[PDB]
């Protein structure tokens, strides 16, 4: 999503969580914070909506 933005993902502020120790609990926290980043992306998406056509 970030390196090759295949759609309009390039124009929202979000930041992907990274792991450090490479670990399953750490992976769990990574998933939960990707959810919370998805909350961010929904908020900015609703505020940036263009009314073009289907």
């Amino acid at each position: 999503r970030k390196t090759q933005p295949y759609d309009v993902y390039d124009q929202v502020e979000f930041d992907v969580p990274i792991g450090s120790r490479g670990d399953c609990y750490d992976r769990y926290l990574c998933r939960v914070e990707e959810m919370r980043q998805s909350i961010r992306i929904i908020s900015q998406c609703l505020n940036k909506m263009p009314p073009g056509e289907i």
Binding site: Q37, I42, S43, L46, N47, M49, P51
Partner: protein
Amino acid sequence: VKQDMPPVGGYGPIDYKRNLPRRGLSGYSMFAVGIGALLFGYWSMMRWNRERRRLQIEDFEARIALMP
């Protein structure tokens, strides 16, 4: 006239912060609470056991005096 669904002038924010209050109670004080309740129990237990020893001494006197 057009009747799509845009936001109505824009939308309010939604936070995404991790609300964890770390309450708490300053756990050294919780040790103070636990040792205080523990020692309360020891003092009251001490008093009650020694008075029950008194009344058990009365029961010893009962079997002593009654026996012959």
